[PDB]
């Protein structure tokens, strides 16, 4: 996946970022928003780096995490839960 789009905002006192990669996939990480909030800063840093290089990467996500209907409608319910570098279009580092 190439990360092609990046969105940042805030909801209910929590900053979040969204990414879209290309089929297309969207995933959002939210600061202090359990279970995956502990990873917000590491994933932000990594995703912004990969958006800059444009290198193919693996996006790990969890569907149905975000539940505010206007948010899910405009963006996604998917939580970003991990990122990996890739060697080929199918072979990437990690689980």
């Amino acid at each position: 996946v190439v990360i092609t789009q990046f969105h940042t905002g805030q909801i209910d006192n929590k900053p979040y970022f969204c990414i879209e990669g290309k089929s297309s996939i969207s995933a959002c990480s939210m600061k202090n928003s359990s279970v995956w909030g502990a990873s917000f800063s590491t994933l932000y840093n990594q995703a912004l780096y990969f958006y800059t290089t444009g290198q193919p990467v693996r996006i790990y996500y969890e569907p149905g995490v975000w539940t505010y209907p206007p948010f899910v409608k405009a963006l996604t319910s998917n939580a970003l839960v991990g990122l990996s570098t890739c060697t080929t279009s199918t072979e990437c580092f990690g689980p």
């Binding site: 840093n45 800059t52 290089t53």
Partner: protein, 321 residues
């Protein structure tokens, strides 16, 4: 778009790595620049080191009238001709024709007087030519050694056309500052000159060759040429706003200068040694060009710019910790 953009990899992604905010000014030490057409927004400063006092080119010869404009257009033209780094501005230092005594030296000495405070203003000095008939060489060597010790600027110098083996040439027939041959380990590492030879038209991945011919043929020789860059069937701008096509080490030098300018934008605080080592280490090395170019180096703009902009990503783009 021109053929050499794919050959050296001036892709959309590579160019997207460069920093828009950095004031980048290339020193075009030549026959004067006509800031017309695609160069109409490119002026930063203009100088004269010629007896007539004009910073604008003269019609002594068509070659000399067009030379400075041609070179500046390859570097930074914004429309018409495709400049390597269109965000760069140009500082024109007219040294020829009807130059003052040691016009080339006076222009480099004016650059080195550091009037402009920004690190990227005249950090890259393009010399698409130079001086033959150098007998003293004392003036050039004392200035070029000081520049290497100061470690902030780079001179991108054409090795000259005539297709001659620089190793077999007489000292008097060699072009300066390219002919600078540092002696000590200290002066060899500190060397601020990047000696550029011309390549014939090729496609990325294809084994390039030096541009030949009795007139526009690239000079060559291992330990006298640092890198080889495109220098054949090159479209450039003329003061009358029309375009011309040319070959030679002048074109090749202007293309290297543009690549370095693009790199400079990512961190102009980086030393001359840091940028020269990145450009040359990122260069493709061909076995067939070893006798002609030191380590058979060919300009890889994609590898040079991406390597340099990635190395500076965390210190410059992501300081926050």
């Amino acid at each position: 778009k021109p053929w050499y953009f794919d050959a050296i990899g001036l892709t959309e992604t590579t160019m997207s790595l460069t920093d828009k905010n950095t004031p980048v000014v290339v020193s075009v030490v030549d026959s004067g620049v006509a800031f017309i057409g695609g160069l109409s927004d490119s002026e930063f400063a203009k100088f004269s080191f010629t007896q007539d006092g004009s910073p604008f080119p003269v019609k002594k010869s068509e070659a000399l009238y067009i030379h400075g404009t041609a070179m500046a257009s390859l570097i930074a033209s914004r429309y018409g001709i495709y400049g390597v780094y269109p965000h760069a501005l140009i500082s024109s230092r007219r040294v020829i024709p009807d130059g003052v005594q040691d016009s080339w030296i006076r222009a480099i000495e004016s650059i080195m007087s550091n009037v402009f405070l920004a690190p990227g203003e005249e950090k890259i000095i393009n010399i698409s030519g130079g001086q033959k008939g150098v007998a003293s060489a004392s003036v050039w060597t004392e200035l070029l050694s000081r520049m290497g010790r100061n470690n902030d600027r780079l001179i991108v110098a054409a090795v000259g056309n005539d297709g001659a083996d620089i190793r077999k040439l007489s000292a008097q027939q060699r072009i300066w500052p390219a002919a600078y041959h540092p002696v000590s380990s200290v002066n060899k590492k500190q060397d601020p000159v990047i000696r550029v030879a011309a390549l014939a038209q090729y496609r990325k991945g294809e084994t390039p060759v030096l541009h030949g011919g009795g007139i526009t043929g690239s000079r060559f020789g291992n330990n006298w040429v640092d890198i080889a860059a495109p220098g054949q069937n090159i479209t450039f701008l003329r003061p009358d706003a029309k375009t011309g096509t040319g070959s030679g080490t002048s074109e090749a030098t202007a293309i290297v200068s543009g690549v370095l300018a693009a790199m400079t934008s990512c961190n102009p605080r980086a030393t001359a040694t840091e940028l020269k080592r990145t450009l040359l280490e990122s260069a493709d090395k061909y076995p067939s060009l070893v006798d002609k170019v030191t380590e058979g180096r060919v300009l890889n703009a994609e590898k040079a710019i991406s390597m340099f902009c990635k190395k500076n990503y965390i210190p410059v783009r992501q300081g926050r910790m």
